[PDB]
Ligand binder design. Structure first.
Ligand SMILES: C[S@@+](CC[C@H](N)C(=O)[O-])C[C@H]1O[C@@H](n2cnc3c(N)ncnc32)[C@H](O)[C@@H]1O
Ligand SMILES: [Zn+2]
Ligand SMILES: [Zn+2]
Ligand SMILES: [Zn+2]
Ligand SMILES: [Zn+2]
Length: 270
């Protein structure tokens, strides 16, 4: 009875939140919201952002390449001492731990350069949905995603690692999960998606995940401050939940029990 009224208002609240997410988003794919399991409405104190929101005094970002064919000429990755990340079908072909150096605002090439993938934004329609076995909100794809494909970036506030430590003291276990050290080549900065984030803010942990982190440099060449991209590790089917390994944010208190469901589940998130 109280329940029935709450369900009815919940439906309206989730619709209004979906509409707001779609106004805020700057990428091609749609964002959907669904809760067929319980009465949870939209989270409070969460603001959708498309890119890193740096703290006061933190600056994010120029030479580019001059290729007429960035796929076959000596291009931005070459200049940085690395391989081109991508094959002709937009799939990442370099191993985890290798940085992605995409072409940038200073390169001569246009949008359809095969070295401009992360920067084009998420192409897939995705749904924030309520999980059925106690893992809160999660994210699923509504369409099939090819192996080794760009899905979404991890974004949040960009703060110092010192700030994240201090913030973490007042965070519960969930809040700590929103801290993402940018430790590719430096211990200086941390992404905090707790309050400001994109759809990656709702992606759950798995012990056999279907997404994998890569560091990305576009206009930014300072390796203290990589952008973080999530690429698929395998073919992901329509309707499938997206997951990454929270322990693999980089290659560097109650223990939360892992409910990922994998046969090889490690039992705990932390
Ligand atoms: C970054 S949040 C992800 C979205 C979150 N499920 C929500 O409702 O907003 C991480 C938190 O989600 C839950 N979670 C994610 N993966 C889980 C898993 N495999 N098993 C149990 N809980 C999980 C835990 O509460 C964890 O602290
Ligand atoms: Zn080039
Ligand atoms: Zn370039
Ligand atoms: Zn290019
Ligand atoms: Zn697990």
């Amino acid at each position: 009875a109280e329940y029935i009224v709450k369900k009815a208002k919940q439906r309206i609240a989730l619709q209004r939140w979906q509409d707001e997410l779609n106004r805020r988003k700057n990428h091609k794919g749609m964002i959907f919201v669904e809760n067929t399991v319980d009465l949870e409405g939209p989270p409070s104190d969460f603001y959708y952002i498309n890119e890193y929101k740096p703290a006061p005094g933190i600056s994010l970002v120029t030479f580019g390449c001059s290729c007429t064919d960035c796929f076959f000429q000596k291009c931005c990755p070459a200049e940085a001492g690395v391989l081109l990340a991508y094959n002709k079908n937009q799939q990442i072909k370099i191993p985890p731990g290798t940085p992605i150096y995409e072409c940038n605002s200073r390169c001569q090439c246009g949008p359809d350069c095969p070295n401009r993938i992360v920067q084009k934004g998420t192409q897939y329609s995705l749904c924030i949905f309520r999980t059925s076995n106690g893992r809160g909100w999660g994210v699923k794809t509504l369409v099939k995603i090819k192996r080794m494909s760009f899905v979404m970036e991890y974004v949040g506030e960009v703060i110092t690692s010192e700030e994240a430590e201090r913030r973490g003291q007042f965070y519960d276990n969930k809040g700590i999960t929103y801290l993402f050290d940018l430790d590719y080549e430096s211990d200086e900065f941390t992404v905090d998606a707790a309050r400001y984030g994109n759809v990656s803010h709702f992606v759950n942990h798995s012990c056999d995940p279907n997404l994998q982190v890569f560091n990305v440099f576009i206009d930014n060449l300072d390796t203290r401050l990589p952008r973080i991209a999530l690429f698929s590790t395998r073919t992901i089917n329509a309707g499938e939940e997206l997951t990454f390994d929270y322990q693999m944010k980089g290659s560097g208190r109650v223990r939360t029990v892992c409910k990922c469901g994998a046969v090889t589940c490690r039992g705990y998130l932390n």
